[PDB]
Design a protein around this motif. Structure first.
Motif, PDB file in Angstrom:
ATOM      1  N   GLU A   1      70.710   5.509  11.210  1.00  0.00           N
ATOM      2  CA  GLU A   1      69.451   5.291  11.869  1.00  0.00           C
ATOM      3  C   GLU A   1      69.010   3.915  11.772  1.00  0.00           C
ATOM      4  O   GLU A   1      68.209   3.420  12.731  1.00  0.00           O
ATOM      5  N   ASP A   2      69.176   3.361  10.586  1.00  0.00           N
ATOM      6  CA  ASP A   2      69.060   1.734  10.544  1.00  0.00           C
ATOM      7  C   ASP A   2      69.866   0.938  11.664  1.00  0.00           C
ATOM      8  O   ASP A   2      69.308  -0.005  12.141  1.00  0.00           O
ATOM      9  N   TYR A   3      70.932   1.502  12.283  1.00  0.00           N
ATOM     10  CA  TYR A   3      71.394   0.679  13.208  1.00  0.00           C
ATOM     11  C   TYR A   3      70.931   0.911  14.354  1.00  0.00           C
ATOM     12  O   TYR A   3      70.766   0.061  15.515  1.00  0.00           O
ATOM     13  N   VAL A   4      70.449   2.157  14.921  1.00  0.00           N
ATOM     14  CA  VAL A   4      69.970   2.722  16.095  1.00  0.00           C
ATOM     15  C   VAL A   4      68.761   1.706  16.124  1.00  0.00           C
ATOM     16  O   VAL A   4      68.476   1.102  17.307  1.00  0.00           O
ATOM     17  N   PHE A   5      67.937   1.647  15.266  1.00  0.00           N
ATOM     18  CA  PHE A   5      66.766   0.624  15.261  1.00  0.00           C
ATOM     19  C   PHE A   5      67.282  -0.843  15.721  1.00  0.00           C
ATOM     20  O   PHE A   5      66.497  -1.480  16.710  1.00  0.00           O
ATOM     21  N   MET A   6      68.253  -1.216  14.997  1.00  0.00           N
ATOM     22  CA  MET A   6      68.637  -2.563  15.493  1.00  0.00           C
ATOM     23  C   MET A   6      69.505  -2.787  17.040  1.00  0.00           C
ATOM     24  O   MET A   6      69.047  -3.641  17.672  1.00  0.00           O
ATOM     25  N   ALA A   7      69.948  -1.502  17.552  1.00  0.00           N
ATOM     26  CA  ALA A   7      70.233  -1.569  18.907  1.00  0.00           C
ATOM     27  C   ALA A   7      69.128  -1.494  19.793  1.00  0.00           C
ATOM     28  O   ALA A   7      68.892  -2.471  20.865  1.00  0.00           O
ATOM     29  N   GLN A   8      68.117  -0.773  19.269  1.00  0.00           N
ATOM     30  CA  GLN A   8      66.494  -0.976  19.948  1.00  0.00           C
ATOM     31  C   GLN A   8      65.949  -2.500  20.007  1.00  0.00           C
ATOM     32  O   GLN A   8      65.534  -2.958  21.008  1.00  0.00           O
ATOM     33  N   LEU A   9      66.109  -3.044  18.733  1.00  0.00           N
ATOM     34  CA  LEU A   9      65.761  -4.415  18.477  1.00  0.00           C
ATOM     35  C   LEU A   9      66.443  -5.668  19.499  1.00  0.00           C
ATOM     36  O   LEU A   9      65.794  -6.397  19.896  1.00  0.00           O
ATOM     37  N   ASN A  10      67.865  -5.330  19.455  1.00  0.00           N
ATOM     38  CA  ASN A  10      68.618  -6.243  20.414  1.00  0.00           C
ATOM     39  C   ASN A  10      68.104  -5.913  21.717  1.00  0.00           C
ATOM     40  O   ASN A  10      68.125  -7.018  22.640  1.00  0.00           O
ATOM     41  N   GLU A  11      68.014  -4.669  22.240  1.00  0.00           N
ATOM     42  CA  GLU A  11      67.453  -4.539  23.445  1.00  0.00           C
ATOM     43  C   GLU A  11      66.139  -5.095  23.841  1.00  0.00           C
ATOM     44  O   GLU A  11      65.844  -5.749  24.844  1.00  0.00           O
ATOM     45  N   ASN A  12      65.279  -4.974  23.019  1.00  0.00           N
ATOM     46  CA  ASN A  12      63.697  -5.470  23.132  1.00  0.00           C
ATOM     47  C   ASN A  12      63.935  -7.011  23.025  1.00  0.00           C
ATOM     48  O   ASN A  12      63.244  -7.413  23.929  1.00  0.00           O
TER      49      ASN A  12
END
Lengths: 233, 4, 234, 4
Positions: C4-15
């Motif tokens: 769940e912490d990595y998902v968020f990072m994937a989202q942050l990288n995309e953002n």
């Protein structure tokens, strides 16, 4: 040959592969003499388009950090994860700034003789210290601002030798105001400096403005947008 | 904005 | 750092549009237990397509310049030489990115998938990343790649029949698979035939679904028609 | 164009 490296820079630019463009420009920065006008523009284009994405990212990550922080139950881990990720970018920014700032001080500024170059490079110097000052705080910031302000003031003294409508002279004034407004928080002082620069272009609008019409008339428009933005506040 |  | 912490990072990288890092953050997830969720499947696609896209763009730009310079009335050989090395540099970068993911599809993602709506995704992807290799390969090896694409797309198309006609995945396949037939092979007939079937089949099921997925399905349908209207010259 |  030089022109083949220029062609390579132009190809990198054509392909939007700026990280390489920085390198194929440095390879020309190693060569003899001062950089041309065309060769200068490429240098600015490469570094601007390298730093730009990171500057953009930094702001989004910063907005998301604040957004995360400002809540009833702040997740302690995500703030950590974010902080580290901002700090990862800040480093890239630092490296990309030091890279060019070094070359300006060591290679470019001492090599230059004509004014337009001096103002270009001194402006540039201002810009990258200004980009460093966007994320720094407190006292590091104060010393960076100092380094910017002197580069901008060096650019500004010599810009007085260029026509009021020179894209370098306007481009300078535009950024120098932005420096005041965004880094030093001096709306009056930025408005003065913008307005003064704009009005001098308007007086010399009738006066020959020819091949700089595209580049100048843009910066004139940008000065205004800023003036409207800052006046209405 | 700033200069291009 | 959990999943769940990595998902968020994937989202942050995309953002933050840092896709090279996103591709890694998704690799960090790829190695964990179970299949990927619908959220995770998308981020995967988003990461790889915004890593490959720039290089696809570059390749075409360089190829086109290489074409311009050769055609000149008194060409410069060293320039043509230096461009052609550079095109090969990017070509190098592309195949790395295609293999990287194709490998993951073959070994990791295709075998572990159970539901059809995941299976169509992972085949469609194989198809896409083969098709991207076929865009710059020379004839004899290209032909072998086209073969691998056609199979991934057929495997996807077989299974897509289970999904509703308006399912974005099902419509997204038909679109890319028609584009395959039009661009990599040179079969306008097949492409139009394929696109009209999916378009028309969507129109029938338009009423039944598309409640909140209206935007995703609708956008693709628009794309199918855009192509179809271009390709009726045949 | 292809699917996004």
């Amino acid at each position: 040959t030089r022109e083949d490296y220029v062609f390579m820079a132009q190809l990198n630019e054509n392909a939007e592969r700026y990280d390489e463009m920085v390198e194929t420009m440095r390879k020309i920065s190693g060569m003899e003499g001062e950089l041309s006008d065309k060769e200068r523009n490429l240098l600015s284009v490469a570094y601007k388009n390298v730093i730009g994405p990171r500057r953009a990212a930094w702001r989004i990550v910063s907005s998301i950090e604040a957004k995360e922080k400002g809540r009833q139950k702040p997740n302690a881990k995500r703030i950590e994860q974010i902080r580290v990720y901002r700090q990862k970018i800040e480093k890239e920014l630092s490296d990309i700034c030091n890279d060019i700032l070094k070359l300006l001080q060591e290679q470019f500024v001492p090599r230059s003789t004509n004014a337009d170059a001096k103002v270009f490079y001194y402006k540039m110097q201002g810009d990258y210290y200004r980009y460093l000052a966007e994320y720094s705080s407190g006292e590091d910031k104060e010393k960076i601002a100092g380094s910017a302000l002197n580069a901008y003031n060096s650019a500004f003294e010599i810009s007085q030798q260029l026509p009021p409508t020179h894209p370098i002279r306007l481009g300078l004034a535009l950024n120098f105001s932005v420096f005041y407004y965004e880094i030093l928080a001096s709306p009056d002082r930025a408005c003065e400096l913008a307005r003064k620069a704009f009005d001098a272009a308007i007086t010399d609008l009738d006066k020959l403005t020819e091949e700089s019409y595209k580049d100048s008339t843009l910066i004139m428009q940008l000065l205004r947008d800023n003036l409207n933005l800052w006046v209405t506040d | 904005a700033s200069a291009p």
